[PDB]
Amino acid sequence: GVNL
Amino acid sequence: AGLRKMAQPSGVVEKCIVRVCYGNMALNGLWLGDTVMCPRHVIASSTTSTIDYDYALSVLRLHNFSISSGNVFLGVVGVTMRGALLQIKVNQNNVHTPKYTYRTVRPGESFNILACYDGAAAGVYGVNMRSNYTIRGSFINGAAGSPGYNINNGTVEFCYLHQLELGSGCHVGSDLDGVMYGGYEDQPTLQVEGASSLFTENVLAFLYAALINGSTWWLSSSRIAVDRFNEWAVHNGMTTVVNTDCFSIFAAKTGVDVQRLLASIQSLHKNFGGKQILGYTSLTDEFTTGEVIRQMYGV
């Protein structure tokens, strides 16, 4: 996961 | 003539975008009436390790927020948690708030993304909710808070605020109640997406539009029964088709029955034979029957  | 994944005009949504900055974090927010919604990880100190969101909210200093629509700067009256979102009360009403509702979209439904950067609309494209509850978007870091929306009869139906990326064409948001789609977490953890299945109803809408537009080379001269197809589908990455009823209108404009397209689907699945169909070389489930009818006929 990448929190944008 | 022509099938194009399009977006509804972004004008009315464009005026609702704000920049939401907290400390060194900045992302986009949606400003409706006197409320700004934005992803809650803007108050996290780092998006690299697990976040105690409740902790960050309790130590939050209101004056540390900077929320602006252009150089309209918005004073923050209050902040509340709304699931994966922050509900920020601001001291000014957005006079350009459209008529709006919130609605959680279900898999196989289309909507529009207004992709935003640093609090300003950057572009717009249509998407379709995949069965694993992700969308095939184009978000970079700082695009979180980008709204998803539909427009029906002057009402804007907000359905999406961008939250995170778990793969190259794999984007996840929350609806406007703060519920993450697909139940993914807003944490930098090991989550992977569920397998996806092509929405057979959407693929059939696509192939009808292909016929309407003069592409017929792929059309099977065989036929398969819906029941037969459905047993094949659950093993080859496709949804069953439940109601053949909505294709009555399409099977008139063409002399092609669903069962003919369903045989075509089986061969086209994993193969277009070196050719293309309306530019595509692979079955797409991005078009709903509604989208396709609107585009070919205006009805």
Place this chain on the structure above:
Amino acid sequence: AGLRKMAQPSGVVEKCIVRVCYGNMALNGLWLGDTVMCPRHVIASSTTSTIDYDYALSVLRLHNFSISSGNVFLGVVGVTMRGALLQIKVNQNNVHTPKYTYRTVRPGESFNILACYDGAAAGVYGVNMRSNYTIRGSFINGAAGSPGYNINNGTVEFCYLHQLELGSGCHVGSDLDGVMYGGYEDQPTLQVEGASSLFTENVLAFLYAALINGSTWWLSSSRIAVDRFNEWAVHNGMTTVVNTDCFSIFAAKTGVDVQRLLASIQSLHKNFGGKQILGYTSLTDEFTTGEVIRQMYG
């Protein structure tokens, strides 16, 4: 991560769309300052025989025009012919006129279509001018006058007003000086689009966009010489490549040189469609280098 044919936001352009009616004809106009521009076949009678547009203008009654922005109708002061367009002087300024310029686009360039019906925006999407000067659009009857545009530094750059459909999704418009793209006529007669070739410069922009996003399954290890590829391209419906320095920005970010990408292009043409690139047909030529950079980094 990811790449999408996006459209630049349409709000600034939405406020300039008006409905233009004349007789039993109705289409879209572009209202800037005190002038409305719209295709001239709104004054046409027959839709199967050649039209004498000059005679049509000679007998035009200004009161036969009905021009409306939303529910508000504008008074028509004058009409003048402008190539394949009419320039209609109206008695009121559009107070929402953006800052704007006119620019003619060339084959291979991208711009945004605001598809309009009855003076109202209905959808927005990005296109790329094909080598035969058509765009792969989505228009049904009534879309004429839909503007194409690009936004550059707060300035709207109008490049296209929709005119006609030749066949399929082959759409033809004029620029804003009234010059039809490709030279097609605004006559309901039998015209054929020329052939179209894939823009190799655009495929390369797309392939670089794939690399920057981590998609590398298609990338050759062996390189091919620009001239060798050019010999192949002309027999495989792709355009030749002149200069490789326009891809310097991508070389500087990927370590990968154009000659490796041209070798990949030929192998992707050999097994055309065997796998997607970023959910797109490999060899999609609708992305320009500018689009890619603007989308990827900003």
